[PDB]
Amino acid sequence: PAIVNNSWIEISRSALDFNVKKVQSLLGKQSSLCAVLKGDAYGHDLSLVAPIMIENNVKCIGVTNNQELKEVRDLGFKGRLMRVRNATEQEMAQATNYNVEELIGDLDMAKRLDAIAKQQNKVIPIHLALNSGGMSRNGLEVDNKSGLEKAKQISQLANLKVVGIMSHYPEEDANKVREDLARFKQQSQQVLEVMGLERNNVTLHMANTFATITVPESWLDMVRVGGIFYGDTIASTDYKRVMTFKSNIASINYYPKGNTVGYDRTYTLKRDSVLANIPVGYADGYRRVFSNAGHALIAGQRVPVLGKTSMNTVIVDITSLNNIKPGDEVVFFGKQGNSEITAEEIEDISGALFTEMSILWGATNQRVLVD
Amino acid sequence: PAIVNNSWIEISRSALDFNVKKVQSLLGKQSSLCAVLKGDAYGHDLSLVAPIMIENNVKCIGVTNNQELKEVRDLGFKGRLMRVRNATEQEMAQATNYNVEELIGDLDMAKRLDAIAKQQNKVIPIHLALNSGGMSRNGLEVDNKSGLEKAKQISQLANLKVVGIMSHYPEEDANKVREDLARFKQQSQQVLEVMGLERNNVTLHMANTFATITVPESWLDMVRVGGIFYGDTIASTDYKRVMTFKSNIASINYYPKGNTVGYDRTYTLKRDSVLANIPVGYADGYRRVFSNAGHALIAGQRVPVLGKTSMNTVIVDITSLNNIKPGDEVVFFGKQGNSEITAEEIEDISGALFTEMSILWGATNQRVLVD
């Protein structure tokens, strides 16, 4: 007996499959695809999304946590499995269990990983992260002779193998991309030289979703793409959205003009009203940011959230609809009839990119594969 | 082999136990305690918190979702189990499996629940929610003769039993509490009268954490308290915080003056710098709201988050510390040495109450029972 969900997120298998096939088609036999499925596949559920990558013969996947790395192996993925962030010794020592290529951007961390590999009688594959793009996040600054000297020392560690060299773009702007690209191509060249590595045995990779779509020169040996799979990109509208966030009406309540709604009485009814009580609140990631601001879809029509969101309940005004029934389907993101809640309005209310919302919705609501 | 966590939330068993015992001591033999453990025990993990209630002989618990209701029964709770929101037919029909007292504030929903009880050959217990407090959320308006008539009709439904009558305060202000209290005491009286119910067979309850601490006259037959268990209340500082949110340093990176940090290069280094890369980001609920705003604790000292949070990584400035090592413990909420990150600064950065943060952190990071 499946437990009944207060709310749920539909994950369109056909949309994902479409998107995977489309990127694959765009690259062709150029470069190669690394599917970046961090953040629990950006809220879409690593359990749901990874098998779909595996069925499309994707050969490389990037995640961040040991849990994710374990899960991806458990789902039968056999190929190249990368961690797309710097990780701790504790993390990396356990993660040899899953044959992961780690991301190293500092010599001390390279020495510490090399000590772990010596301790386990292994040679551990790494991607050397450079700060060519300028993130000053995961990557080694190799702006000069002494940064290059650090890279040379990393190449002398007998129990690492450098299988890749990478950077990452700070700004989704085609021209800033082209600049950082030229800088990476120049720096990675010197790095290969000081490290004694053959360009043909080392995967060069810099591009993310925006670069992959916008700046074909970026593709290099491999692209690292994420948001592309969920139509989440400022660079195209041809990749399909994958999530639809739904619930149902728990009660339909009649209240007089003059009544107020919600904590601190922040919305006053201007008319006798009919209010839908929906069991979604901020514990479902429907945050306080939506208070007197959000909209939902009911009967194919956009209706407003009234007052402050509660932890587990939101109230929407249905006074202008009719023939609405308890149990009627409500949509908080996605399509219903000829209405839609868009990513863009979610960003504007929330004050942050949509990917943060999809991740936080995905963490707080059951995902169900559809289509 | 336990999977290594990128980050984790310590849940102090001793703090919770302290808080439970303290409320219990405050009420004594007056009223009674309903522990409200919705929102996954406000982010503290229903799996961890419920057994602690059960060991303290708590006799009544309130949650919201069927999953939670199932879990609380599965953990061996035998007592009075309430749903503290309006719920759908789908939800309520399944939830007889767990012997739940539902929350009904409309006659149609009362009729629909009564139809479900007739369909299952049961008499289903309910709490009749009134809108005395003014939420216009879960509760019946019984301001007059015709609202009272709806309550009379609810009392004529042969397959519900009214075991309780309740309201809820919109405003944590002692005087507004006292007002709403007088209104509830007056309305619930008429309601008992029109419904043919004996006051002695029906639990009256209105108080939440703030009312329970601030306005002793509120306690009535039962209090419904939540945030009290986690020291989460504007009404006292004597209840202990329960959560500590931790991670560790993944890499320590040296970068020149003039370098920038993070997406869109929003922070420029003013000096040669030493930066700690920590594997916590917005996928761990460390939202973009913390960009160039947050602080962490390292070596017992408060240090700033630099640039925009990434999905899985935050960078903090450690240039002013020394002898810092990879794997060193980092604290994002709670105490370390003689430094602290407080609930109040989390609210100010986030723009919302702390409970939303604790819930969203709890949804995106492993909880580990300590003490």
Numbering used by the authors:
A (entry chain A), B (entry chain A): 37 to 407
Sentences from the paper on this structure:
Expression and biochemical characterization of recombinant Lyr has shown that its preferred substrate is lysine. We next solved the Lyr structure by molecular replacement with the Bar structure as the template. One Lyr molecule is found in the asymmetric unit. With the exception of those for the first 36 residues, the positions of all main-chain and side-chain atoms are well defined. Two Lyr molecules associate to form a dimer related by a two-fold crystallographic axis. The tertiary structures of the Lyr and Bar protomers are similar (RMSD = 0.89 Å for Cα positions). The apo Lyr structure has also been established within the internal aldimine linkage. Given the relatively larger space between Thr391 and PLP in Lyr, and Ala393 and PLP in Bar as compared with those in the Alrs, a substrate larger than an alanine may better fit the space. Mutation of the inner-layer Thr391 of Lyr to tyrosine, which is positioned similarly to the conserved tyrosines in Alrs (Tyr354 in BsAlr), reduced the activity of Lyr towards L-Lys to 53%.
In addition to Alrs, a PLP-dependent racemase is found to possess a broad amino-acid specificity (broad specificity amino acid racemase, Bar, E.C. 5.1.1.10). Notably, Lyr is also active against arginine, whereas Bar racemizes arginine, lysine, methionine, serine, cysteine, leucine, and histidine, a useful feature for biotechnological applications. To further develop lyr- or bar-based marker genes with desired properties, we determined the three-dimensional structures of P. putida DSM84 Bar and P. mirabilis Lyr, which are the first structures for lysine-preferred racemases. All structures contain PLP, which confirms their PLP-dependent nature, and the positions of their catalytic lysines and tyrosines are similar to those in Alr structures.
